[PDB]
Design a protein around this ligand. Sequence first.
Ligand SMILES: C[C@](O[C@@H]1CC(C(=O)O)=C[C@@H](OP(=O)(O)O)[C@H]1O)(OP(=O)(O)O)C(=O)O
Length: 427
Amino acid sequence: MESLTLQPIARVDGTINLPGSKSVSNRALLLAALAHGKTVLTNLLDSDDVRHMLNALTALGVSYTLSADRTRCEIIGNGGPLHAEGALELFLGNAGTAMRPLAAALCLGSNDIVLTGEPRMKERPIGHLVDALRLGGAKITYLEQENYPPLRLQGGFTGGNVDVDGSVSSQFLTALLMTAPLAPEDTVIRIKGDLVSKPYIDITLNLMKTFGVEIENQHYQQFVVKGGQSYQSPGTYLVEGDASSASYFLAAAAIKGGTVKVTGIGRNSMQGDIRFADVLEKMGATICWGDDYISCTRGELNAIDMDMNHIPAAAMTIATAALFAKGTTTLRNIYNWRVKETDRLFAMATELRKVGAEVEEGHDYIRITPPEKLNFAEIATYNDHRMAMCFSLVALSDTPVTILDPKCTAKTFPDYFEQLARISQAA
Ligand SMILES: C[C@](O[C@@H]1CC(C(=O)O)=C[C@@H](OP(=O)(O)O)[C@H]1O)(OP(=O)(O)O)C(=O)O
């Protein structure tokens, strides 16, 4: 068991050029692979989730080249649905943005492919997506627990009337949206009830349009898609910096700045997590917006009580930032934290108490009352990059913190600790 100990950080200040967005990167790679023509992606993220998508594309026969730092990728589009037979196994780590989208996309035409991943991925739900794909004609088999990967895909999604549950993950709808345009028949996707993580759907539609396809969005309750379309290379495409990864650095400034500026995202970003900056502002920090940067400057930090369903990833960062705020913070409507890299409500509550907070772990919310002063803890990270990054903020205090399995940040941000160190100042 590897670990990293962070000594107290007296002040943070500086500029971070953000690693590429994981959400945009994996959507762009799959759309580029399906598209006609050569796509050149720049500012692509190099992290485990992207690497698993790249390996899957290699396995499927897609040709591409990567620059030395793996942030520039020249992809030769397949000009249509990807194919493989013989129950070829694609190992997808714990990448939801590879597992959910490929589970749908590979249902086009005939195929015989198995999708699997790390143990935790076999515990992340996918039944709502499988139900929807089957309504459209796909043949899908659960090889282990019903409603979870691994899956054996045998093709057959032709389109039609498809209902999909949007209450647990927006990724199921995302996967259907990217797939349906290439199906032979038109598809009408009806959302059953609620839709969580709605901003990620806007990221999907934005990327689909960049690749030549638009659909009819009826108030997010129903989506009308014309079949028989084709994705087309947009030529060179710049991947946005990752707004979820930015959250740690902006929160660091709100706690212990200084001014921290992150570049690669700005007021025009398509990512929902730039709204994390509005939460810091509500807590008392000062935010500056640019075309290609967001900056945060220390002001004060007051507790808040907010529904965080629109920024589930960055919301975790408020849970540790809350340790430094005045008052009790409550984060609501975040049930799906439970079905991600780990059950994040259980994990966040457990680790927060270790550094001294009094915490109520609600079924779909968390309430945090900070201690007068933090104490040292060895933080468990649950194979979850975000637990490691969130708890790194404990060091913006008088106490060091030890983070177990620090390399788990590689899921989306291999260089996280060096980047936090870059803005950490002793004076
Ligand atoms: C969970 C995480 O990020 C998810 C990425 C994502 C997307 O479509 O790009 C949508 C959200 O999932 P949901 O709709 O289920 O809330 C995010 O939480 O990772 P993932 O890609 O493995 O699912 C994360 O990085 O924290």
